[PDB]
Every structure is written in C-alpha cells, then in structure tokens.
Amino acid sequence: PLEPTDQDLDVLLKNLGNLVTPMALRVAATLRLVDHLLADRTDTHPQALSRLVRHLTVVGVLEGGERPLRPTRLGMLLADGHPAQQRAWLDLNGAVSHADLAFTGLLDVVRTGRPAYAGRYGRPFWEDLSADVALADSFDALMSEAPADAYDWSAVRHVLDVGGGNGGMLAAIALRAPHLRGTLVELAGPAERARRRFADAGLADRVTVAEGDFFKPLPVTADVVLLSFVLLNWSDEDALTILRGCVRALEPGGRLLVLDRADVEGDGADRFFSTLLDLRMLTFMGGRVRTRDEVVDLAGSAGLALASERTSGSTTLPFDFSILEFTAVS
Amino acid sequence: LEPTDQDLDVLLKNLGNLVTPMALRVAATLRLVDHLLAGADTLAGLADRTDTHPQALSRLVRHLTVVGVLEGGERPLRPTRLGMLLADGHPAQQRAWLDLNGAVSHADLAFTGLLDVVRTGRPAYAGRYGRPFWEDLSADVALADSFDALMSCDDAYDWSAVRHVLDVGGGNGGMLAAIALRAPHLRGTLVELAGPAERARRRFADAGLADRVTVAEGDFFKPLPVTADVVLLSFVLLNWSDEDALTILRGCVRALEPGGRLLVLDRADVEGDGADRFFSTLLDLRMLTFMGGRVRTRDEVVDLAGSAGLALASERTSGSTTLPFDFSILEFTAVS
Ligand SMILES: CC[C@@]1(O)C[C@H](O[C@H]2C[C@H](N(C)C)[C@H](O[C@@H]3C[C@H](O)[C@@H](O[C@H]4CCC(=O)[C@@H](C)O4)[C@H](C)O3)[C@H](C)O2)c2c(cc3c(c2O)C(=O)c2c(O)cccc2C3=O)C1O
Ligand SMILES: CC[C@@]1(O)C[C@H](O[C@H]2C[C@H](N(C)C)[C@H](O[C@H]3C[C@H](O)[C@@H](O[C@H]4CCC(=O)[C@@H](C)O4)[C@H](C)O3)[C@H](C)O2)c2c(cc3c(c2O)C(=O)c2c(O)cccc2C3=O)[C@H]1O
Ligand SMILES: C[S@@+](CC[C@H](N)C(=O)[O-])C[C@H]1O[C@@H](n2cnc3c(N)ncnc32)[C@H](O)[C@@H]1O
Ligand SMILES: C[S@@+](CC[C@H](N)C(=O)[O-])C[C@H]1O[C@@H](n2cnc3c(N)ncnc32)[C@H](O)[C@@H]1O
Numbered sequence: 001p002l003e004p005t006d007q008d009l010d011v012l013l014k015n016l017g018n019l020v021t022p023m024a025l026r027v028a029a030t031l032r033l034v035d036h037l038l039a040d041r042t043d044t045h046p047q048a049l050s051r052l053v054r055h056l057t058v059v060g061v062l063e064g065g066e067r068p069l070r071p072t073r074l075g076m077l078l079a080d081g082h083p084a085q086q087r088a089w090l091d092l093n094g095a096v097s098h099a100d101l102a103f104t105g106l107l108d109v110v111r112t113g114r115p116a117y118a119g120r121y122g123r124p125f126w127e128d129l130s131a132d133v134a135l136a137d138s139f140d141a142l143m144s145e146a147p148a149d150a151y152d153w154s155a156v157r158h159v160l161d162v163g164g165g166n167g168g169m170l171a172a173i174a175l176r177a178p179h180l181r182g183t184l185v186e187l188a189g190p191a192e193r194a195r196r197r198f199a200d201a202g203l204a205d206r207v208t209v210a211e212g213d214f215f216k217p218l219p220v221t222a223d224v225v226l227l228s229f230v231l232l233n234w235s236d237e238d239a240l241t242i243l244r245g246c247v248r249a250l251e252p253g254g255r256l257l258v259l260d261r262a263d264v265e266g267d268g269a270d271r272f273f274s275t276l277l278d279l280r281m282l283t284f285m286g287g288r289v290r291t292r293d294e295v296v297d298l299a300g301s302a303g304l305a306l307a308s309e310r311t312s313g314s315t316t317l318p319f320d321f322s323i324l325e326f327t328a329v330s
Numbered sequence: 331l332e333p334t335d336q337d338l339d340v341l342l343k344n345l346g347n348l349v350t351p352m353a354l355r356v357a358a359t360l361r362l363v364d365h366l367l368a369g370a371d372t373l374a375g376l377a378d379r380t381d382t383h384p385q386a387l388s389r390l391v392r393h394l395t396v397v398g399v400l401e402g403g404e405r406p407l408r409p410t411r412l413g414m415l416l417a418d419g420h421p422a423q424q425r426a427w428l429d430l431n432g433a434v435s436h437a438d439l440a441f442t443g444l445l446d447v448v449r450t451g452r453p454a455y456a457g458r459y460g461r462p463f464w465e466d467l468s469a470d471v472a473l474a475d476s477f478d479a480l481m482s483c484d485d486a487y488d489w490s491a492v493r494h495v496l497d498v499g500g501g502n503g504g505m506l507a508a509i510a511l512r513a514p515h516l517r518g519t520l521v522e523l524a525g526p527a528e529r530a531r532r533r534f535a536d537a538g539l540a541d542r543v544t545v546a547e548g549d550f551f552k553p554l555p556v557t558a559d560v561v562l563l564s565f566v567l568l569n570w571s572d573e574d575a576l577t578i579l580r581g582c583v584r585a586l587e588p589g590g591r592l593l594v595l596d597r598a599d600v601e602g603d604g605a606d607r608f609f610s611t612l613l614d615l616r617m618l619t620f621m622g623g624r625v626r627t628r629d630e631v632v633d634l635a636g637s638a639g640l641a642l643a644s645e646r647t648s649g650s651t652t653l654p655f656d657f658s659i660l661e662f663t664a665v666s
Binding site (some may be wrong): 001002003004006008009010011012013015016017018019020021022024025026027030031042044045047048049051052054055058060061072073076077082084086090092100101103104106107109110111112113167197269271272273274275276278279280284289301303313317318 | 331332333334338339340341342343344346347348349350351352353354355356359360374379382383385386387389390392393397398399410411412413414415420422428430433438439441442443444447448449450451465498524580596607608609610611612614615616619624653
C-alpha cells in the first residue's frame with residue numbers, strides 16, 4: 001500500500017486542495033493590485049487588506065511591506081497590459097471568474113451531470129449574458145489567423161458561420177478573401193454586435209446576419225459551414241442535432257469545419273487544460289470537451305466523414321486546438 | 331521584470347486554479363479513494379457505489395488522473411502515492427477535512443464571498459449559509475458532529491504541582507483526557523457548548539476518568555463555574571476578535587486561583603520561528619472568512635493578554651505529529 005510523503009501533503013495543502021489562494025488571486029485581480037500599487041485606494045477594510053497581502057506575499061505574488069511593496073515577476077501576470085490577460089480572466093465582475101464560483105456546486109454536478117450555473121445565479125449561462133450587459137461585454141473581450149489563414153478559400157464562395165459570435169472570425173475570413181459571401185447565425189445579443197462589425201468593416205454587401213436558433217433548421221445553404229467552439233458547449237444529444245442541422249445546410253460537395261479542442265493520442269497537448277475546459281463546460285452549461293475520435297464518431301452519426309485535420313494554437317496562452325473538415329457521406 | 335512561461339504555468343494550474351480544489355473536495359466526499367481500495371476496479375462500479383452520474387464521474391476522474399491523485403484505468407484505476415492522502419485511515423485525515431458534508435470544507439465554500447470580506451472585514455459564512463458559524467453548528471447537528479471529529483487529536487508540561495485543570499472550550503475533551511491519564515493525581519473540568527460537552531462526557535465515562543474529570547455545559551462569555559490552578563485555552567482565541575478574546579481572557583483570569591497559570595495553545599508566530607507562513611496566513615484568512623477571528627503573532631497574543639492583566643511566564647514550541655503545523659504553548663500568570 002502506497003505511503004504519502006511530507007511533499008505530497010505539502011502539494012495537497014498548498015496547491016491541489018487549496019481553495020483559499022485561488023480566491024485570493026481573484027480578489028487581488030479585482031482590485032488591480034499589480035496596477036493600483038503602480039493598497040487602500042480601494043474601499044477595502046484596512047486590516048483585512050494587509051491580511052490578504054500577507055497571504056499574497058507568501059505565495060509568490062508580492063514582496064516588500066514593513067523593502068517596498070512591489071509585485072514579483074510572477075506578480076506581473078495581473079498587470080493590465082500583459083498579453084496573457086490573466087487579470088481579466090480572474091476579475092470577479094468578468095464572466096469567466098463569475099462562472100468559476102459555481103464550482104462550489106461541483107458535488108451535484110457530478111451526482112447528476114447537470115450544470116451549476118443556474119443554481120448560483122438564476123439564469124443558465126447564455127441567457128444570463130444576454131440579460132446582463134456587463135457579463136456579455138467582459139466575456140466578449142476575453143474571447144477576442146487560425147481559420148482565415150489555415151484554409152484555401154479560393155475554392156469556396158459562401159461561408160455560413162453557425163454560432164459565430166460577434167462575427168470576428170467571419171469578418172476576417174471575408175476581409176482576407178474579397179470574393180466570398182458570408183452568413184452568420186446567432187442569438188440576438190451577439191447578432192447585433194455582428195451587424196455593427198460587418199457595417200464598419202464595409203462588408204454588409206456580402207456578409208449578412210440571420211438572427212435565429214441553431215436547433216431550428218438553418219436559414220441558408222452554403223458550401224462551407226463553420227462550427228467554431230460551439231460543440232463543446234453542448235451535450236451529445238444537443239451537439240448531434242446542431243450537426244444534423246449543419247448537414248442539411250451543406251451544398252453538394254460542401255465542407256463542415258469544426259474548430260474545437262480535439263485531443264489526439266500523441267498530441268503533446270497539455271491534458272490539464274483539456275480536463276479544465278471540460279469541467280468548466282460541464283459546470284457552466286452541461287457541455288463537454290471531446291477528443292478527435294469522439295467528434296469524428298458524433299459526426300458519423302450525423303452522416304459526416306473526416307476528410308482532413310490540422311492544428312493551430314494561441315499567441316497568448318498554452319492552448320492547441322484543431323480544425324476538422326468533414327464532407328457529407330451520401 | 332518579464333513573466334516567463336513557467337510563471338504562467340504556475341498561476342493557471344496552482345495559484346489561480348479554483349477547479350482542482352473543488353475536484354479534490356468532491357473526491358474526498360464521494361470517498362472515491364476508499365472505494366477503489368475496497369475492490370472497485372472499473373468506472374461503472376465506482377459510479378454505482380457512489381450513486382453518481384457515470385460520464386460526469388469519469389470526467390472528474392480524468393481530471394484527478396491528470397493532476398496526480400489517481401492513475402490508470404484506460405493498469406486499473408487506483409490512488410497515486412499522493413492520492414493515498416484521501417484514504418480515510420491516513421493520519422493527516424485530509425479526506426475528512428476536504429469532505430463537503432463536513433464543517434470545514436462546507437465553510438470553505440464561503441471563500442467565494444472573499445471580495446466582501448476584504449471590503450468590510452466581516453465574515454462571509456452568513457451571506458452564503460444564512461446564519462454565522464457557531465450559530466449554524468448549533469442548529470445543524472451533523473455539521474457539529476463533523477467539526478468535533480475533525481478537531482479530535484486521536485501533554486509535556488510539568489503536572490506534579492497541579493491539582494485542578496479547567497479546559498475552557500476544550501472540544502470533545504481529548505486534551506484533558508491525555509493530561510489526566512499522564513498525571514493521575516489531577517482533577518479536571520471541561521467547559522463547552524452542548525454538543526462537545528456530551529461527547530466529552532462519553533469519552534471520560536468510556537476511559538474510566540469520570541470520577542475525576544467532569545463536564546460543565548456553559549458559555550465562556552459568561553463567568554466560569556469553577557476556579558482551577560491551571561486554566562487551558564487551546565485553539566480558542568483565534569476564533570475571536572480582539573474584543574471577544576479579551577472577554578474570554580478576563581473570564582479565565584477570574585477563575586485562575588492564586589498563583590495559577592493560564593496556558594494558551596495557539597499559533598504564535600515569532601520573527602525567526604522558521605515556521606511556514608503559508609499555514610499562518612491560510613488559517614488567518616479562514617478565521618476572518620468564517621467567523622471574524624484572527625491568528626495572532628506571539629507579540630499580539632502577549633499584548634492582548636497584558637490587557638486582561640496577564641504576564642508571560644514561559645513559552646514553548648510544539649507541533650502536530652501528522653501535519654506541517656508548529657504551534658506554541660504560552661504560560662501566563664495573573665499579575666496580581
Ligand atoms: C486558457 C486557454 C483558453 O482560452 C482555451 C479556450 O479558448 C479557445 C477558444 C477561444 N474562442 C474562440 C472562444 C479562442 O480561440 C480562437 C478563435 C479565433 O477565431 C482563432 O483565430 C481569430 C483571431 C482573432 C481574430 O482576428 C478573428 C478574426 O479570428 C484564434 C487563433 O483562436 C482561444 C484562443 O482558444 C477557452 C478557455 C476558457 C473558456 C472557453 C474557451 O474556449 C470557452 O469557450 C468558454 C465558454 O464557452 C463559456 C464559458 C466559459 C468559457 C471559458 O472559460 C481557455 O481557458
Ligand atoms: C493545516 C493544518 C491545520 O489543522 C492547522 C490547525 O490545526 C491545528 C490545531 C488543531 N486544534 C487544536 C484545533 C489540532 O492541533 C492539535 C494536535 C497536537 O498534537 C495536540 O497536542 C499536542 C501538544 C504537543 C505534543 O507534545 C503532542 C503529543 O500533542 C494539540 C492539543 O491539538 C490540529 C492537529 O492542528 C487548524 C486548521 C484548520 C482549522 C483550525 C485549525 O486549528 C481551527 O481551529 C478551526 C476552527 O477553530 C474553526 C473553524 C475552522 C477551523 C479550521 O479550518 C489547519 O489549518
Ligand atoms: C463559445 S461561443 C462563441 C463561438 C464563436 N464561434 C467564436 O469562436 O467566437 C458560442 C456561441 O454560440 C451562441 N449560441 C448559444 N445558443 C445558441 C443558439 N440556440 N443558436 C445560435 N447561437 C447560440 C452564443 O451566442 C455564443 O456566441
Ligand atoms: C478550535 S475549537 C476546539 C478547541 C479545543 N480546545 C481543541 O484544541 O481541540 C474551539 C472550541 O470552542 C468552542 N466554543 C465556541 N463558542 C463557545 C462558547 N460560547 N462557550 C464554550 N465553548 C465555545 C467550540 O465548541 C469549539 O469546540
């Protein structure tokens with residue numbers, strides 16, 4: 001029988017089992033401490049704050065105090081202008097950090113498969129973003145060349161982006177390739193941001209917004225259909241019906257492009273971030289991160305076969321994702 | 331300076347990671363490790379044994395495998411070396427500490443309200459669960475049972491001159507039983523809330539200590555029902571604000587017989603202790619977040635004691651056998 005050491009127990013207490021520090025880092029981010037210093041210009045109880053700072057000091061985020069109180073190298077990651085933007089990710093008014101707090105309901109989540117977001121905040125995730133302007137804006141800012149660059153658009157005329165958000169990706173494919181038409185299918189909130197972006201990019205003549213619900217049949221056909229970070233939001237049955245709607249909308253010889261996290265045997269991709277994203281999707285909305293093989297198999301059920309596979313990444317965070325091109329079977 | 335890759339890795343996986351600690355608490359709660367040790371080899375069997383959603387569970391397990399608590403499955407699924415900390419019989423008892431049906435992990439969830447703790451200096455426990463810590467345990471007996479079981483420790487002072495020990499807030503009475511068994515001439519009295527007090531009655535009756543160790547249910551904010559030549563305050567003061575700690579201290583001074591000694595057992599940091607300040611601050615944030623308490627340095631405890639009329643006679647370092655946790659034993663005399 002295996003026997004824990006002093007170092008195992010130290011890792012459990014300080015890292016793997018530690019819920020205090022992650023909360024302390026979120027509070028610190030939500031007071032721009034690594035900026036505000038460059039801490040009581042903050043509406044904070046004076047005693048409470050130094051108690052927090054003492055903890056932030058011990059875990060390698062600050063130094064100094066009663067020589068001078070300055071962030072460490074690590075501490076700089078909560079610097080507003082750092083290109084990892086971890087300060088905004090951790091900010092408690094932001095939509096992700098806000099969602100993260102629902103992890104305290106993880107017990108029920110695992111008992112039942114059901115999301116926790118509603119239990120903590122009233123509305124399920126997407127409904128909450130559209131009724132609350134501030135969470136929509138912050139989520140938007142956090143999720144802002146992969147497809148436009150990875151793909152030969154010369155043999156394509158019409159791209160239908162399903163659940164394509166504020167239109168950023170469709171705008172860019174269209175700006176890169178002047179000959180293309182595009183159509184975006186989205187809920188109201190992101191649809192309206194799409195209209196504004198298309199109009200200001202001078203694309204309204206060839207790139208349109210069709211507000212709607214991707215569980216209902218898609219309004220148009222197209223020779224390329226895009227599902228970019230959509231499937232992971234949904235359960236198998238729900239992702240199956242989105243896929244099936246996508247197949248119907250596919251012109252002859254048309255291609256479905258799935259942009260998502262899709263791990264492969266010897267990928268080299270950090271499984272930590274795969275499981276983390278996975279538990280987030282489970283907890284926030286009952287979705288799931290799927291591997292390459294699982295996506296392929298769900299696509300097969302919807303009448304689609306894999307034609308090609310490629311990778312992209314991130315100029316910011318350690319996150320490899322894939323683009324999986326599918327054709328109709330019959 | 332410029333943050334390296336390594337420093338981003340640490341923030342995301344450790345310092346900023348709220349998911350993994352909740353995953354540990356869920357695993358502790360479902361007794362996942364114990365179920366694997368008692369024969370469960372498959373995912374399916376685990377799921378029936380824990381009455382959980384099979385796919386959801388397998389996804390928790392994948393996360394637990396990645397972070398090093400579990401390993402293989404896909405030979406069969408078992409704890410890692412580190413994961414054996416979650417076995418219920420491990421001396422560190424981390425499975426019970428992390429258990430979401432137990433008081434401490436329960437109260438840990440109130441850390442989501444930390445922003446308003448840092449803003450107001452008030453505890454968050456009430457904002458989440460309705461009533462504040464001790465009131466809650468008072469009203470919810472299953473949470474009070476688990477809190478008493480967690481503080482259980484299942485001493486090296488000089489007891490030969492001592493006749494009567496008063497343990498103020500002495501939990502279910504483990505400290506008092508240890509002292510009495512080591513010093514047979516001694517008499518004992520425990521003051522505690524109703525739950526701890528009955529569990530202490532049971533302990534002493536079972537041990538053969540009832541004829542010289544007695545229990546008095548009571549409240550240490552009201553005057554104490556006996557005097558003793560030694561009074562003990564073991565991990566009481568850190569639950570309270572300066573003000574409440576002071577009215578406990580004065581209650582204890584009043585029950586201190588002529589020439590008596592007040593023993594305070596608490597975390598009492600000193601500048602060159604070498605004691606790990608991670609645990610000092612963690613526990614400090616917990617006392618703030620849970621009940622408006624505070625962990626005090628040696629100087630702060632000794633200054634507070636001064637206001638109640640007490641002078642320090644001696645101080646000793648000791649520490650838990652199981653966890654990395656130094657603490658101190660501060661002996662005081664009534665200054666008149
Ligand atoms: C730490 C890594 C990571 O960002 C990983 C993951 O983000 C993925 C998907 C992002 N998108 C699209 C939402 C984003 O992917 C992009 C999209 C973009 O089209 C692609 O090329 C863009 C570049 C920008 C632009 O010019 C337009 C035209 O095109 C770029 C290289 O990658 C990011 C880099 O990786 C990701 C995270 C968190 C969350 C999500 C993620 O997809 C979610 O989808 C998510 C969610 O859906 C609901 C609640 C919470 C979350 C999350 O908390 C992460 O933690
Ligand atoms: C990370 C570990 C640690 O358990 C540290 C701390 O526990 C300490 C104090 C415990 N007591 C008394 C409350 C308890 O300490 C012990 C063990 C020690 O060996 C024992 O005696 C000594 C004296 C020296 C000696 O020779 C040997 C043989 O015996 C002493 C009387 O009690 C525990 C094992 O360590 C401690 C923690 C958490 C909490 C508390 C703690 O005291 C609390 O007191 C606490 C609370 O009071 C209310 C809500 C929540 C908490 C907590 O969440 C943890 O952080
Ligand atoms: C992760 S997001 C953004 C994905 C986007 N393709 C991107 O890469 O930025 C998923 C999107 O799908 C949308 N969505 C959710 N339910 C929907 C539905 N029933 N119909 C259409 N869109 C929906 C949301 O509005 C959200 O913008
Ligand atoms: C950390 S605990 C246990 C301390 C115990 N001396 C030990 O070291 O194991 C604090 C204790 O003080 C008690 N307590 C809280 N309020 C009290 C009160 N008003 N009167 C008596 N005991 C109280 C609790 O019952 C709890 O057992």
